[PDB]
């Protein structure tokens, strides 16, 4: 349907480079995460999206949901994987 627009900001790169995306609300947010990740040249498999205030975001749902739940300002942080 109609489009929602996000602004994802890379926190791993101290330049803090953002990227503005606009997808229809029916688009699964994993596609937005994917595009923004490869656009930032970071792997989407070990990157994660949190909201502007710190709330984690589950990308496995329509973009319309993410917008109303969390907003338009998001951040792409890295996924820490540790065991040891």
């Amino acid at each position: 349907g109609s489009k929602v627009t996000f602004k994802i900001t890379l926190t791993s790169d101290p330049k803090l480079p953002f990227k503005v995306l606009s997808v229809p609300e029916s688009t699964p947010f994993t596609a937005v995460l994917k595009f923004a990740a490869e656009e930032f040249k970071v792997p989407a498999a070990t990157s994660a999206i949190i909201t502007n205030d710190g709330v984690g975001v589950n990308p496995a749902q329509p973009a319309g949901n993410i917008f109303l739940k969390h907003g338009s300002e998001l951040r792409l942080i890295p996924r820490d994987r540790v065991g040891g």
Binding site: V55, G56, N58, A60, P78, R79, D80, G84
Partner: protein
């Protein structure tokens, strides 16, 4: 002049706010006026519990239910009156004169202007808790169950003086004594600088060996032991404590038949609800429809002025005072290790977790999860906080159960389910959201120095959410339970629970060998990025 009373006026204001909380529609509803009862330590003139109640619940039948639920040294000491238009049930020795403006503004000064013989005091919790598991049996003639149960409990209090409580470990014994045989300063070695929820002396309740429908109610009985307590002082209380539980078991059983569920056995639970400096002693029905249960929860909240936000009286929230008392997820698991520490002294301001939790280290759940399990293990410590604080009753998931959630939520794959793979905070946040519908917040850093710089964000979290925090970076996963931070020195210390593997349930190792102690700010590597997940608790009882 001489009869000055002491009262935590600030805590009284909160209790009123907690009762008023169930409305959330001030000046919108039509209701009966609000009065209340004042409970406290009559001997030293110290008000401990101020319980507000709408009018209908200002009855003799209800006041007896409250007083039988409070600790043994506490009794009815007065009423209260809001805007001079509350009902007063005759009793006590005074009547608190409160006003609407006073209760809204929370003006301590205005309370003291109207109640002249009162002095505000931040009342703290003193003394330890003596506990013993006690059983008794009642016989109820068919058709006269309700008639007998009131009487069967009457003569039980009359024979509650022939009891003898004995601690085998330290050779401690409390029984009826002649006033001159009283052993002064008896349990001062145990009650000095002690707190009711942590310091516990366990006794076995014994009786002299030479002295229709059936009903047997086994259950614990808790009475406090203070510093300077005589041996006789402990006896008087240990008797009054047992009488109250029996009356409570009676009262709960009687009105159970009047409400439909008939005659049911009762499980005994003891709580330390948010803000209280004394304990709550309750007898809860074991059988009833879920409608009957949730209504019983709501009403106990209203009666004892408990919040409608936090869950308080869930069975899993009940204190583990007695050893034979049943437990939800406390296998060999240690509850709240960080509390068994006095090695430490503050370097400044200190804020810690708000609630119980269990230490989940390596290899403890059968299988050996060596160097990959650390992230899973901290997830489990978090989950324990949610069951021990009444947010759920689902058991702490196994490693396979965790990994399956990641596959179900469509993050990591089916082979992931099988594996010994590594995860982190970001996967933890996903499982909490899938299994518990939880929301998590993150502190995303790029260095271990930034972790120290953004300590105020941690201190805020523990002050507002209280949930334990896992931290993941430098191939290691940990659990942060507190933080010590001086906002002038810049000196910063971290309270860390190490998910990495200790032998077994032994605090002496854990406390002293560093597995659960305070860490310097140099604990985090400056060359690696760190993430912290901050699990956020819901807002419903």
């Amino acid at each position: 002049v001489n009869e000055l009373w002491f009262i935590d006026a600030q805590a009284m204001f909160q209790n009123y706010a907690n009762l008023r909380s169930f409305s959330k529609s001030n000046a919108n509803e039509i209701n009966t006026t609000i009065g209340g009862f004042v409970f406290g330590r009559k001997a030293r003139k110290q008000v401990i519990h101020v319980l507000f109640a709408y009018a209908e619940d200002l009855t003799e039948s209800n006041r007896q239910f409250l007083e039988s639920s409070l600790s043994a040294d506490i009794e009815l000491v007065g009423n209260l009156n809001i805007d001079g238009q509350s009902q007063i049930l005759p009793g006590g020795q005074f009547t608190l004169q409160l006003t609407s403006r006073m209760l809204e503004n929370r003006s301590i000064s205005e309370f003291l202007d109207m109640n002249v013989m009162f002095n505000n005091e931040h009342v703290l919790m003193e003394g330890a808790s003596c506990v013993s598991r006690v059983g008794y049996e009642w016989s109820l003639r068919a058709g006269r169950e309700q008639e007998d149960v009131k009487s069967a409990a009457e003569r039980l209090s009359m024979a509650s003086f022939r009891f003898t409580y004995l601690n085998a470990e330290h050779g401690l014994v409390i029984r009826e004594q002649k006033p001159e045989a009283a052993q002064q300063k008896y349990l001062d070695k145990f009650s000095k600088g002690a707190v009711p929820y942590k310091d516990v002396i366990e006794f076995t309740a014994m009786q002299s060996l030479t002295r229709f429908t059936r009903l047997v109610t086994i259950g614990e009985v808790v009475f406090p032991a203070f510093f300077g307590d005589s041996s006789l002082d402990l006896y008087k209380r240990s008797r009054e404590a047992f009488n109250r539980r029996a009356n409570n078991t009676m009262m709960v059983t009687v009105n159970g038949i009047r409400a439909g569920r008939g005659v049911t056995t009762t499980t005994s639970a003891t709580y330390l609800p948010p803000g209280w400096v004394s304990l709550l002693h309750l007898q809860l029905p074991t059988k009833w429809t879920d409608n009957e249960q949730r209504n019983y929860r709501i009403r106990l909240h209203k009666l004892f002025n408990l919040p409608s936000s936090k869950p308080v009286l869930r069975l899993s929230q009940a204190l583990a005072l007695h050893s034979e008392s049943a437990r939800l997820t406390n296998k060999k698991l240690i509850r709240e290790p960080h509390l068994s520490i006095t090695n430490y002294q503050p370097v400044g301001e200190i804020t810690t977790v708000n609630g119980p939790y269990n230490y989940h280290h390596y290899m403890q759940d059968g299988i050996d999860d060596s160097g990959w399990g650390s992230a899973y293990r901290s997830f489990q410590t978090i989950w324990s906080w949610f069951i021990l604080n009444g947010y759920t009753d689902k058991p702490v998931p196994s490693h396979r159960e965790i990994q399956q959630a990641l596959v179900d939520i469509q993050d990591k794959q089916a082979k992931f389910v099988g594996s010994r793979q590594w995860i982190g905070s970001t996967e933890i946040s996903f499982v909490l959201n899938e299994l518990l519908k939880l929301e998590c917040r993150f502190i995303a850093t790029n260095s271990g120095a930034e972790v120290v710089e953004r300590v105020r964000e941690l201190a805020r979290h523990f002050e507002t959410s209280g949930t334990p925090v896992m931290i993941g970076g430098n191939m290691l996963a940990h659990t942060i339970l507190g933080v010590d931070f001086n906002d002038t020195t810049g000196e910063t210390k971290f309270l860390v629970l190490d998910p990495h593997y200790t032998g077994s349930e032994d605090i002496k190792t854990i406390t002293s060998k560093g597995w659960c102690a305070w860490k310097p700010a140099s604990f985090w590597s400056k060359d690696h990025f760190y993430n912290m997940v901050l699990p956020q608790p819901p807002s419903d009882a």
